[PDB]
Design a binder for this molecule. Structure first.
Ligand code: HDI
Ligand code: HDI
Ligand code: HDI
Lengths: 114, 114, 114
């Protein structure tokens, strides 16, 4: 899986083990082995949510399977929880796009997962 | 809705009220309340369009509904208009990907919109 | 087509004709004229792949058509080859998301391709 977080929160406000925690938590949540998890955090971004400059996050989670109504709701609780606790971002200022990728559409190691 | 603009235009060339203008214009265009609009501008990017380094923009608009043939054509006129006027980017050097998101695939405030 | 590469590799490690090479190689691979190819490289990113901070890349290729099982496998060989040779990124630390865009969902020059 691939998880990206774009936020206006400063680089200095991102805890040092944040990428590791996301990797571990997402592996547990998705049931996918930690080795397949890719995490990307982009701080100091120029962004607004509802016209406000307060802390916010625009994210996305891509995964071959493990994406659905029920699963996405628990991912949002997990993710908003982490962003709130570690980055101090209010849950209502977070958007997460979920993508159920077809294995033939995910390239890795000179080929695709299909 | 979520609108992202990635551009090679320098940070200093992004007008101060640009995110607010985008928020207000997108709300009117989509019919979605301003409070739900998230905007993200990423300047100083390393990019090329057609092999040229002249000013260009790679964008995306995600929305639950309000995405379609007709709607997308007007969004393009609105967006290219704003990028041309405020960022001085030629309309033919702008790409915008539109995504009609399923409500169950958009996380917000510890849950999803489904 | 639109190709984006996000990587933790430093800005200084990106060869100066990299965007041009990607443009030329992608035009040949996709059969699309070079003038329609947009390339975007984002170095110095805060990312982890499998919990490791070693060089890695998270990419995506959007195209109206020219996306499929067979095509995606050759794009992956081409792309991982380039990332390995120019950015020294191991192929197994590269993810590429492929998107077959509907023409009505791609805005360009005040309209869409539909
Ligand atoms: C070994 O099979 C897997 O479970 C592979 C993993 C990797 C993956 C994935 C999906 C989408 C991406 O943008 C990146 C990685 N999804 O599942
Ligand atoms: C009243 O509820 C809404 O209309 C909510 C808005 C917010 C939204 C949306 C979709 C996709 C995103 O990446 C971000 C926001 N779509 O609709
Ligand atoms: C002649 O028509 C084309 O080949 C148009 C090109 C442009 C294109 C494309 C798709 C998705 C993008 O985000 C940007 C460009 N795909 O094909």
């Amino acid at each position: 899986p691939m998880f990206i977080v774009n936020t206006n929160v400063p680089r200095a406000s991102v805890p040092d083990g944040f990428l590791s925690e996301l990797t571990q938590q997402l592996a547990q949540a998705t049931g996918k082995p930690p080795q397949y998890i890719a995490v990307h955090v982009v701080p100091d971004q120029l962004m607004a949510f509802g016209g406000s400059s307060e802390p916010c996050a625009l994210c996305s989670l891509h995964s071959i399977g493990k994406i659905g109504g029920a699963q996405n709701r628990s991912y949002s609780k997990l993710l908003c929880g982490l962003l709130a606790e570690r980055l101090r971002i209010s849950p209502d200022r977070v958007y997460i796009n979920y993508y159920d990728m077809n294995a033939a559409n995910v390239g890795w190691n000179n080929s695709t997962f299909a």
